[PDB]
Amino acid sequence: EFRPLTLPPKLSLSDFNEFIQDIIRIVGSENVEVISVDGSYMKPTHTHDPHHVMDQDYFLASAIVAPRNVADVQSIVGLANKFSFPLWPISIGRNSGYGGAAPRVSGSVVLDMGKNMNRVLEVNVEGAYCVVEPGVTYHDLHNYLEANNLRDKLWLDVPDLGGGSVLGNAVERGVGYTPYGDHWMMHSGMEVVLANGELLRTGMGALPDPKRPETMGLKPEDQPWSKTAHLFPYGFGPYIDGLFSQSNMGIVTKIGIWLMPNPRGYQSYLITLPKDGDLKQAVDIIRPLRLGMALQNVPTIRHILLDAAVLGDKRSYSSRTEPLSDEELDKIAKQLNLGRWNFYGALYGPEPIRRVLWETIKDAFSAIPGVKFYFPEDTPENSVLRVRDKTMQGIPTYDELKWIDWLPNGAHLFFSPIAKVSGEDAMMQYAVTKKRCQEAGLDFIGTFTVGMREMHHIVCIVFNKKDLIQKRKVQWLMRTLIDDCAANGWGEYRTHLAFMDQIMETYNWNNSSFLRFNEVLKNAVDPNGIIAPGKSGVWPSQYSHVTWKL
Amino acid sequence: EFRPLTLPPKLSLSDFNEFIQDIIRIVGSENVEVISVDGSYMKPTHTHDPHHVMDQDYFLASAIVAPRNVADVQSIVGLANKFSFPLWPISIGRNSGYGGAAPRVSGSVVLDMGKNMNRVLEVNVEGAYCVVEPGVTYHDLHNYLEANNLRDKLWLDVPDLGGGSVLGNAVERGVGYTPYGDHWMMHSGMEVVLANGELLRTGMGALPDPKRPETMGLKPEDQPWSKTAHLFPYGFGPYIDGLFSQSNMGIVTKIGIWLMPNPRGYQSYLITLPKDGDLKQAVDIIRPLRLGMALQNVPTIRHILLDAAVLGDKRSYSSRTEPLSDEELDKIAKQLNLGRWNFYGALYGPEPIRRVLWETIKDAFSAIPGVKFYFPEDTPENSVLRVRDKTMQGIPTYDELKWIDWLPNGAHLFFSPIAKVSGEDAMMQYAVTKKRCQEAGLDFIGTFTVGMREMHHIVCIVFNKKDLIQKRKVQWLMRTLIDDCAANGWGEYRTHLAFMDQIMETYNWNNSSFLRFNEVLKNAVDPNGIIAPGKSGVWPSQYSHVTWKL
Ligand SMILES: *Cc1cc2c(cc1C)nc1c(=O)[nH]c(=O)nc-1n2C[C@H](O)[C@H](O)[C@H](O)COP(=O)(O)OP(=O)(O)OC[C@H]1O[C@@H](n2cnc3c(N)ncnc32)[C@H](O)[C@@H]1O
């Protein structure tokens, strides 16, 4: 194909066409598309940000490429080093609220790694791990487990929806809700194609499986792994794995992910907190429970509007066009039999141990006036408890997609600061966050997810993507919040394409020492800067900061 | 001082003298010793390898310099850049079995970080963590906690001995014996001086503490951390932390380490396993109880000679010169009331819970005939269990020094391959290692430490450091085990200075892509190659592989 809307920087139409004809010859026409449509979550777009906060076409591919296998990735890396051509690797491209598939730089090729590199490569019972290509969704892996009857042996750890990529998510350092919620920390042994195009496996992936007749003459990409590659992450030497999470340092083609053995018993629960202000005492309670390990998983603390938005759009609760007031949340709370904040967790292992922990947690929270406790069977058919009862046991679902439609053309954008597990800091962050959403004319929606010594506060900004005036207020809210939170001692853990530079500028301890360091590494491994220029605000030297930063 | 024993490569005598005059000016001559004696554990040497497998003077410092503070480190670095002068940074230098404080390159300035940089900087209760400098030993910190009554709120995690640096050991990715035994995984918020001299803090350490009047004009080194620094490791962007463990990528000045809250219940224990072959079913039994958190910590499986050696030297058990027979090891077993393998664990938390766990473990191991369960109270006063009682609850001891003296001028050398948590794998690693130990005329001594999905297998080579015939046999032993283990798909997790090259050459999947990618990052951040050249087999470009490898 001949003519795209946007060319990559410094690249001619004639060069671009040579590149494309070249790539077609490798991967076939059926695996290439040049852009000369926001799609669905069920069928994600690969061309741009479906939940756009800037103009729809602001972050736009010049084309999409789908390698057939790892060899293609290498060949494609080669040509991009030849032509000086920016690549943007996605696994699945369901990173909505962070930009979806869209490339940080327009004119890039989007590498749809997921379409053909699909395979669940291994599920090892005794080692309680699995090995995975970019294309394996949470649901995909769920179904492989069923086919081979492994459901009674091994559980998954799923984020709030079923379609993201196990690896996609893991390298974004994302989060789920079993004791295996720290997704990044569950990996051992990743294979990566570098900016030079050479293959590398990490940790004990670097210790090769010894030779035997069955595996002779296998291309490296197809060689098995030695027996410890997915068991012991460190390997030997400097431990580089993390240089591949949230980086543009390489293109991940495989990853091993630890899986929880069937725990021996499971019980989910809801605790409902009546007052807006109860968040303070509730978090002080969480602290030692989590830290002392009566809280086995990553339990979340949901604001009322999050459950309500699952349950029906805003028109369903009021024809109001302004944020719902403090007192309507009370009415909605009491309609839905929920509190102002709603705490979800679960209990794992034998009855005798579940009993003890539950009595501890039950006891601890009873200090909060008006508290009420529910198992799944005590709630209506449509409840968030029922849905989450699935989630905290590794079953992929999709019911939580509905909150996206809180407003007539609902898109989400995530503001994701980190809080202490302390009522006081939490209230402050809430206050700082709630205040601004207001000035923006938006309902406040958000969770806190509970890590051991921190909470991921996911403020869920939902907007009508066809509304230009609102879009701008969303750009104002985000940028303002980033600042407010930095001035209060809080950083964000993950974000959107349009906020990456701003966010990094925030991690400026000692004259931006962190980003400088990262650039030195980026330019050495990426001398042509072809991988994902601009991810996390890291720019190769051929990318002027003045031209390229937002 | 004027004339040193060995000079760093490519550097004149005239230059060394101008250099050390510049350092003497900064650190004062009290913090400089030019070398022109082995010591012990309590007074550890800073010049060479106290447990030398090569000639005593093979790895040898040219001087030892003791920075008073972070600013002295920046100047020394600046000067080491001026003169191309290798630095070898240590914290305490108790890396016995791995080369102690010896530099990999003879001629280097051993950088004694711990002499003056000494402070327990922070102990935060609600976050349950500490911030520490290199000079703080495990005993140092223990006494800090006792002296503030903190031992009732927070416990430590300690290796077998208490002399090691909390930070130094963690950057070596070392292991301890509570649920906090994965020392490295417990870090958060590292401060690092780079090869160019510049300070950097990782993770949310890069998110600045907001401005206030109390902290104005503080040197970057002396600034506080933002509230989340030591709560959330990741921060934002590429997670570069691990580039600083087992690496030569920088000089660490400060680290945050997570501390486990008093669990509200503790009980250690021993299980004795009569036969040599009982290892196989033991491991097979441990596997599901590890994955399922009936075993909450890092338990150990000790060879009978490990315990035997703590209680008495070889000369006391047999007069024989060769290795001990099988029957002579059942004799020592029945003598000491231990099995051939001895499993040391510990239960944590409230009694209602400790109880259930224990009944599962007891009942799990009962399928092994002649098994015996002991609490500390059930054993002789000198027993290893009584020592590990303290160990598996964060109390330092020094009792385990006694096994080093299993031979006249006993020295240890660790061979530390990683095994699967499977009897088959473990027996195999045992057989492989026992065979070669015979050939070399050594007794086999070691422990397995049970990580979640891996075991660290510490083959404890003790040898007579004044016997040149045996030191050569130990060299042969080491180099053969490395090769054999490799040929059976196992790699070492850490090693001695003389085996760094070989071991790293072992992880050569896809023609040493791992090393090549490591080399690339090193030359980027260390142009003149001054920080610890040769650490983990990673050499900067101006060190010829031909000249430097062993
Ligand atoms: C809409 C929304 C999103 C959401 C959520 C709830 C709603 C309603 N709940 C989440 C949750 O609880 N936890 C969480 O971590 N995220 C949640 N999200 C966000 C999103 O839906 C998921 O996180 C989703 O899994 C992420 O998208 P996906 O997994 O498909 O990843 P991707 O689109 O391919 O992009 C990942 C980014 O990471 C880097 N990347 C990905 N693959 C590679 C490879 N192959 N090599 C190198 N880098 C890779 C890229 O930077 C890419 O941009």
Ligand SMILES: *Cc1cc2c(cc1C)nc1c(=O)[nH]c(=O)nc-1n2C[C@H](O)[C@H](O)[C@H](O)COP(=O)(O)OP(=O)(O)OC[C@H]1O[C@@H](n2cnc3c(N)ncnc32)[C@H](O)[C@@H]1O
């Ligand atoms: C003799 C022995 C040793 C031993 C053991 C039992 C016996 C009887 N059991 C151990 C165990 O249970 N777990 C464990 O991790 N180690 C065990 N050992 C080995 C050793 O004694 C300890 O590991 C000890 O704590 C290590 O030594 P130390 O703590 O003093 O650390 P160091 O010598 O200063 O440094 C070791 C290496 O780390 C790098 N390093 C240290 N500081 C820095 C700084 N700040 N910057 C950059 N790198 C640093 C260096 O590479 C140094 O060589």
